[PDB]
């Protein structure tokens, strides 16, 4: 969180956060609703092991997010494909 | 210490 | 049946039919095939084959409904597509056209 | 004559891609900017000297197509180097 | 400027570029030997001349200003030069697509493009979000490429991931399965193995 509040912190950040994702459902959300806000290599893998890994709580904690789930996740992992690609 | 406990 | 079970067709030619064409998925062959069902003589199929050898809105309505009826109708699917782009290559092409995804959003 | 340049550069950005996908698979069992940038000057180049050549006096150069297949190498490597930069280098050691 | 003053036009343009002020009255009129099968001619074989001549600031609007104009031969060598000149000094992109609507040309010119270029693709793809885009596939299947290739296609990706592999199994596996999202089972019992 301090690093956030502080382009390569950031990176190091969400980095971090996948770690933890990895290490641990509610968690993996807020992660993926991060990332969309976010919106190389490595970053692609972890993305990736994030769409491997991937109820009511979780569901309810999306719906404050947005204030259907799973599938703006695999448009968000398009995208940053995408972006890999591109770059 | 904090960062090698977190890639823990 | 010995030869379903370890993974023919002439005893075949001589659903099921529907599978082994799924199989199959040349030209001479497809000809061959064309012929035994002639003498035979489901009709979906018949029609592609017509029109592969080759009105043109009912063979792609029966295909369409044999898709229905699954990568084997996907591939068949797409070589429709292949061949109804090789024979553009307005109205009534827009009529017809009424990875895949990807291949129609440039076609249009 | 900078079209032999650009030439060399095609070549050992290359094998340059190539050393790092190769590494790559060797660990699951530095480029910059600076590079993607190059291949943009270098396209510029060939478009300059593509243009030079077909007003010359006597007439159009012979090598049209010859740039414009160079062109098109150009144009890869700067995708592939633009891929590896833009996040595909840190995913090297993951299964795809 | 004192024994100029149709025809002491055209000398003081001649004169004045063996350049600002020399095409300007150029245009706004309407080495010998060049000269002579330019007046045999007779805006195309001018700046054409021209160019050739410098070949340089000059040349290169001369040539760019004339093609710009005019828009099998001559649209060619036109082509070339000014994507040439532009990739020295887009261009890619406009040519290409001007072309399409000589095709072993064309796969020459992107022979030469091919990093500039592949950043020229992304933008078009980008933007875009048949000939033309089987040639950039044979292009690229001539890491760095199967990317390549993938952004392009954006099947043809999968395909050759896939052989590609027939650290770097697991990237392959987990792209191949966040871009199909039968596959994805195989995918993941070969990981597993």
Redesign the interface.
């Given at each position: 969180v301090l690093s956030q509040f502080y382009d390569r912190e950031d990176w190091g950040q969400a980095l971090?956060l996948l770690?933890?994702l990895i290490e641990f459902h509610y968690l993996v959300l807020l992660v993926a609703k991060f990332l969309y806000p976010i919106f190389?290599?490595?970053?692609?893998?972890?993305?990736?092991?994030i769409?491997?890994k991937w109820s009511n709580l979780y569901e309810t904690i999306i719906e404050a997010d947005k204030s259907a789930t799973l599938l703006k996740n695999?448009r968000k992992?398009?995208n940053?494909?995408?972006?890999?690609?591109?770059? | 210490d904090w960062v090698e406990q977190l890639i823990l | 049946l010995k030869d379903r079970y370890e993974g023919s067709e002439v005893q075949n030619l001589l659903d099921l039919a529907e599978m082994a064409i799924v199989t199959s998925l040349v030209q001479n062959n497809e000809l061959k095939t064309l012929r035994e069902i002639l003498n035979e003589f489901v009709s979906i199929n018949v029609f592609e084959v017509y029109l592969k050898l080759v009105q043109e809105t009912i063979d792609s309505l029966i295909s369409g409904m044999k898709i229905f009826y699954v990568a084997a109708c996907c591939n068949v699917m797409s070589q429709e597509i292949v061949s109804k782009i090789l024979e553009k290559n307005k109205a009534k092409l827009l009529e017809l056209p009424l990875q895949d995804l990807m291949k129609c959003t440039y076609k249009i | 004559r900078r079209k032999l340049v650009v030439q060399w550069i095609a070549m050992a950005v290359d094998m340059w891609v190539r050393e790092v996908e190769r590494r790559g698979a060797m660990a699951a069992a530095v480029m910059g900017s600076w590079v993607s940038e190059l291949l943009g000057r270098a396209d510029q180049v060939l478009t300059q000297i593509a243009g030079t050549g077909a007003t010359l006096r006597g007439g159009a150069a012979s090598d049209a197509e010859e740039i414009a297949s160079l062109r098109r190498t150009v144009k890869g490597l700067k995708r592939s180097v633009d891929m590896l930069l833009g996040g595909e280098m840190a995913r090297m050691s993951f299964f795809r | 400027e004192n024994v100029e003053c149709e025809v002491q036009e055209f000398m003081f343009a001649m004169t004045l570029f063996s350049f600002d002020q020399s095409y300007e009255i150029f245009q706004l009129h309407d080495i010998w030997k060049d000269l002579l099968c330019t007046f045999t001619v007779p805006h195309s074989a001018f700046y054409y001349q021209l160019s050739l001549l410098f070949d340089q600031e000059f040349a290169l609007k001369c040539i760019s200003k004339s093609a710009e104009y005019s828009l099998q031969d001559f649209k060619e060598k036109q082509h070339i030069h000014y994507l040439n000149l532009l990739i020295h000094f887009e261009v890619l992109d406009v040519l290409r697509l001007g072309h399409e609507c000589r095709t072993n040309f064309l796969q020459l010119l992107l022979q030469e493009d091919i990093d500039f270029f592949s950043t020229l693709l992304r933008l078009c793809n980008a933007h875009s979000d048949k000939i033309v885009d089987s040639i950039l596939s044979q292009n690229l299947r001539s890491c760095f490429k199967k990317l390549y290739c993938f952004r392009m296609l954006n099947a043809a990706a999968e395909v050759l991931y896939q052989y590609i592999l027939m650290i770097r199994k697991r990237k392959c596996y987990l792209m191949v399965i966040n871009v199909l999202s039968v596959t994805l089972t195989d995918l993941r019992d070969e990981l597993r193995g």
């Amino acid at each position: 969180v301090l690093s956030q509040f502080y382009d390569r912190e950031d990176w190091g950040q969400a980095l971090r956060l996948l770690l933890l994702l990895i290490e641990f459902h509610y968690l993996v959300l807020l992660v993926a609703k991060f990332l969309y806000p976010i919106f190389e290599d490595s970053v692609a893998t972890v993305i990736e092991v994030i769409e491997t890994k991937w109820s009511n709580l979780y569901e309810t904690i999306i719906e404050a997010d947005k204030s259907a789930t799973l599938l703006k996740n695999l448009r968000k992992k398009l995208n940053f494909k995408l972006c890999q690609a591109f770059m | 210490d904090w960062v090698e406990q977190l890639i823990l | 049946l010995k030869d379903r079970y370890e993974g023919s067709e002439v005893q075949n030619l001589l659903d099921l039919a529907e599978m082994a064409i799924v199989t199959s998925l040349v030209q001479n062959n497809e000809l061959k095939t064309l012929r035994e069902i002639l003498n035979e003589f489901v009709s979906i199929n018949v029609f592609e084959v017509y029109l592969k050898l080759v009105q043109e809105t009912i063979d792609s309505l029966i295909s369409g409904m044999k898709i229905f009826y699954v990568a084997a109708c996907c591939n068949v699917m797409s070589q429709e597509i292949v061949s109804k782009i090789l024979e553009k290559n307005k109205a009534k092409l827009l009529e017809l056209p009424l990875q895949d995804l990807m291949k129609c959003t440039y076609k249009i | 004559r900078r079209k032999l340049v650009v030439q060399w550069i095609a070549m050992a950005v290359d094998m340059w891609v190539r050393e790092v996908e190769r590494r790559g698979a060797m660990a699951a069992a530095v480029m910059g900017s600076w590079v993607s940038e190059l291949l943009g000057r270098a396209d510029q180049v060939l478009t300059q000297i593509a243009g030079t050549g077909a007003t010359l006096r006597g007439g159009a150069a012979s090598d049209a197509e010859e740039i414009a297949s160079l062109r098109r190498t150009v144009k890869g490597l700067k995708r592939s180097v633009d891929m590896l930069l833009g996040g595909e280098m840190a995913r090297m050691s993951f299964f795809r | 400027e004192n024994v100029e003053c149709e025809v002491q036009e055209f000398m003081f343009a001649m004169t004045l570029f063996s350049f600002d002020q020399s095409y300007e009255i150029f245009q706004l009129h309407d080495i010998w030997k060049d000269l002579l099968c330019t007046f045999t001619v007779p805006h195309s074989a001018f700046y054409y001349q021209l160019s050739l001549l410098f070949d340089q600031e000059f040349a290169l609007k001369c040539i760019s200003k004339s093609a710009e104009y005019s828009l099998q031969d001559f649209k060619e060598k036109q082509h070339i030069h000014y994507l040439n000149l532009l990739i020295h000094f887009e261009v890619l992109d406009v040519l290409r697509l001007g072309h399409e609507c000589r095709t072993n040309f064309l796969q020459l010119l992107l022979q030469e493009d091919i990093d500039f270029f592949s950043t020229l693709l992304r933008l078009c793809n980008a933007h875009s979000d048949k000939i033309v885009d089987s040639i950039l596939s044979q292009n690229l299947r001539s890491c760095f490429k199967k990317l390549y290739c993938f952004r392009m296609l954006n099947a043809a990706a999968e395909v050759l991931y896939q052989y590609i592999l027939m650290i770097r199994k697991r990237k392959c596996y987990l792209m191949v399965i966040n871009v199909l999202s039968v596959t994805l089972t195989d995918l993941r019992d070969e990981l597993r193995g």
